[PDB]
Amino acid sequence: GTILIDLSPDDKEFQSVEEEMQSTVREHRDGGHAGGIFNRYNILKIQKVCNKKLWERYTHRRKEVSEENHNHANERMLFHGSPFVNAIIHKGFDERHAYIGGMFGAGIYFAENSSKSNQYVYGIGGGTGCPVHKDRSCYICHRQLLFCRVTLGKSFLQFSAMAHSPPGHHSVTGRPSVNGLALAEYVIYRGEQAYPEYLITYQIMRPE
């Protein structure tokens, strides 16, 4: 039941999504090992993801969370990079997308930094890079990220140098305490707390 609608580069919705993507690139502690070396992206396409069932699932859950957190869903737009992007847009998020080895436990992880999500499009640590060239820094192969609507509710705050939510919390916020320039990462424990709203197709660009 999923359909993808292409946005025109002239549409302001295209433009505000491209801006979120480009403005949240940062340097990573691995020097680009996992996601490559770039300062910006070539955006090739942005598609709106429409699925009634998955949307209704998301909003039913968002209401429940809101009612348990002084009528505040604490909804964000966040990036998700995954080798399973094709499964997610058709079937939604679920426990198969849980990162068992994650620093904040076995949940589904989202980033404010697009370049953080970009590290995972070929799997943990960047796997072995693109299918065609086995290159984690490939400038040629087309990559995909999701920009998702994520309900955080009451988020447990964890400073930093499918499992359950910490009791009484709806999500976890991993806030980098050492790198002042890294933005936050978030973890949810219920697949129904995220909706994959935009599918963004892109290349990383070789710095000049």
Ligand X SMILES: Cc1cccc2c(=O)[nH]c(-c3ccccc3)c(C)c12
The reply on whether position 65 binds Zn ion by CB under 5 A is no
Is 141 labeled as ligand-binding?
A: yes
Which listed residue (130, 146, 184, 200) binds Zn ion by CB under 5 A? 130
Q: Helix count (H) and strand count (E) of the chain?
A: 4, 9
| Binding of residue 25 to Zn ion (CB under 5 A) | no
User: Residue 148, annotated ligand binder?
Assistant: no
> Exposed/middle/buried for 155, CB within 10 Å: 0-12, 13-18, 19+?
buried
| Minimum distance from residue 78 beta carbon to ligand X (Å) | 8
CB of 37 to Zn ion, least distance (A): 14
Gap sites in the chain (C to N > 2.5 Å), preceding residue numbers: 161
Residue placing its CB nearer to Zn ion in the complex, 90 or 206: 206
CB of 190 to ligand X, least distance (A): 16
DSSP E strand stretches across 60-161: 75-80, 108-111, 143-151, 155-160
x/- track of binding to Zn ion for residues 108-127 (CB under 5 A): --------------------
137, amino acid identity:
S
Residues 117-176 that bind ligand X (CB under 6 A): 117, 120, 123-124
Query: Which listed option, Zn ion, ligand X, none, makes contact with residue 143 (CB within 5 to 8 Å by class)?
Result: none
Per partner kind, with CB cut-offs from 5 to 8 A, the member of Zn ion, ligand X, none near residue 77 is none
Q: Which residues contact 71 (CB under 8 A, 6 or more apart)?
A: none
CB-based contact 77:150 (threshold 8 Å): yes
d(CA 173, CA 160): 10
Binding site members for Zn(2+)? 130, 133, 138, 141
* Contacts with ligand X, residue ranges (CB under 6 A): 79-82, 99, 102, 109-111, 116-117, 120, 123-124, 185
